[model samples]
Target: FRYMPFSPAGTPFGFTDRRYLTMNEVGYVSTVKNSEQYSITVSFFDVGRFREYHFEDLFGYDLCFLNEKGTLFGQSKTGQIQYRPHDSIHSNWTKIIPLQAGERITSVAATPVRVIVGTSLGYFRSFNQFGVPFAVEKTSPIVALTAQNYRVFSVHYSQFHGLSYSLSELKRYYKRECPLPMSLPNINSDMKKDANLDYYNFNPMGIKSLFFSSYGDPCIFGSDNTLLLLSKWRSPEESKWLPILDSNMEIWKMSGGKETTDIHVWPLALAYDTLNCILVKGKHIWPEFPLPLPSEMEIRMPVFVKSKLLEENKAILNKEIQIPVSMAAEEEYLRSKVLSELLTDTLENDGEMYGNENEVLAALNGAYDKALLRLFASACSDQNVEKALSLAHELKQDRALTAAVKISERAELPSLVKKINNIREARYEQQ
Candidate 1:
């Protein structure tokens, strides 16, 4: 019997909720929701009978993989690894390996000979087909792993190197150098005075995830959300890595198939986000197709109105008006400003007034105290004194008049002070 096509049957399942997908030599395995619980469905093509495994306590965060022999291996967050043989659902899963204290498996890859597991603590081990430990090693905390021809290639959490090893002998072949660019400036003497300061002690940017594609090409994902493809550029001795894609994509969980060719990535959820899987082929760094994202994640027009407009307006009004404007007035002003910009040509029209009558009246009733204070300080600091003084007089407030006098007296601008005093007296007479 031939293997089933690696696609969903009928309608796309879990398009509105988070889901995971993986493929093996015989068929594709996917998550299905049955009465508020999660179950796995295995499809084998042409022969037309699908099998499913249900777990009473299984959750979506649990790690799962299927081998070519149709056996399912699953690991939970608490570090329990269990296996279910082909087409069986009721038998108790044989516990294969027990994890150490405070250690959780981060990535897992399977081959014909052994299953490779990488943990968060930078250690990895291999187990034979009968669930016996054969070889083990420790390195920098491992982020991801891909297996090819019984050789496991792993990306370290440090993100500076890729490790290749053989499953039969468990010996490393070569330690490849993949360094990050130096972007931070050297700390100078002024910053070195602190007794607790250390220049060399800095956090290195590490790889957030890694996988080997269908053709055994290693793909590295950086902590900064950069996706790079490690390709053989020149001779067999030299290789180069280049960035293929970068996005706001976040991988909550990932699993590699037995062939180490197919990788499934589950994206983190956002508001109005859809549940979709990113299928990455090992030989090619880019995904099979463009990944779907919520409209919030896509490009959109920029918002011009400041979200803090109401609070900023309140701060200014509270300083000048003895009785501050009501919250109702503030809300009205905010609504008017937003609606006017959207519905009318207010944004295009220069110097267009765009506020409700009550909001305008309340705003004009302020003492102009804050504006005058800023103007006086600006003049004292020798920044736009003449223009600030002119604008202060235009407000026609007793506070602005007093501030202008103080600013002119300090700056020794006698003629300007006389002119401001004359304007203040004229305004007082008119009132």
Candidate 2:
């Protein structure tokens, strides 16, 4: 049986919007049809049958989200995940990703471009349509995950933390879990300014899943029960973000910590949640708070980066343009290659083979290091002090210059020394 949008059969899990709207989100849920040859399909009211399969099973695939690029993902409580890439929604679940021995899929969400997954083993991971993981971190077991663009909020049993990605890198996606996990607030009875609170009073005590409100505010759903609308957000810096909520009623708060110059910026995390934004032009392409993208894993610019500022949007970084070259063009490639290679070798050419400074300098191309030094070594061997002085002046291999000058008994490259020393007089002036 093929899935058809006109049918509108299954429940909606991805969009979860009461009105079933949100352009980037596909409003569909996996459901089972038992009697008619055991059919399973993902569908909703306005969003018709997204995908369906005929199979024998007690339960069908439950969690599902269709990414902006049209890739479809469906997860089963039976510990299976299957997908169809952006170009082939009509195909079968031909791509399947296997997990490790003990891991079981718990939750999944997607940004505009990335699909993120969480597991029973406390693993949080991100992937593009191809199923290659970009972000993977071991955190507490995640009950639910929600994300918009590159910003993500992960909910665990008792607490929740955020995850962020830099504008263009993948390694940064590794485990930069927001340091402090925030949870439902409960206060013990205190003297004076505090109100007493308890976890028992909270309805729908077990957290099940997350969804955004019609106005784009984040809300939590659970227990075949209540949906708690989160209105207030408090960062570690003690600022009140929502106007309607009283200060003490902050729905989520990051307990205090000493903030750093480069990492753990709380205000930014709240804005990603509250504003649900992307920079204007870079939405097709493009956080800090935490760590810069490079400390440990080292890749700063990711391959699937989408930016006009970069090479292309929705693209794997292409290999650089290979320009066609002729025999004359190839000659200079060998020339620079030889000049760099010269630095590692002992000087082979004697001063007699190369007579003109202009010839060497033009080949050197303002290069001031070993290219000239090898030539210096050759000139000194021949006691051609004039060539050695000119070459050494640019790079100033002073020890060799002084040693060769004294040995050759040359009056001055010594004048060249004054020019070199004059460069240093400025440093001596400061000390």
lDDT of 1 by residue, 130-209 (tens): 56787777766654455544556665544344333221224554333244331222345844553212211211222333
State the C-alpha lDDT per candidate.
0.43, 0.36
lDDT of 1 at 302: 22
lDDT of 2 by residue, 339-374 (tens): 323321212322222344345544444333444445
Report the number of clashing residue pairs per model: 5, 3
What TM-score fits each model?
0.39, 0.35
Q: Which candidate has the top score in TM-score?
A: 1
Model 2 C-alpha RMSD vs. true structure (Å) is: 22.3
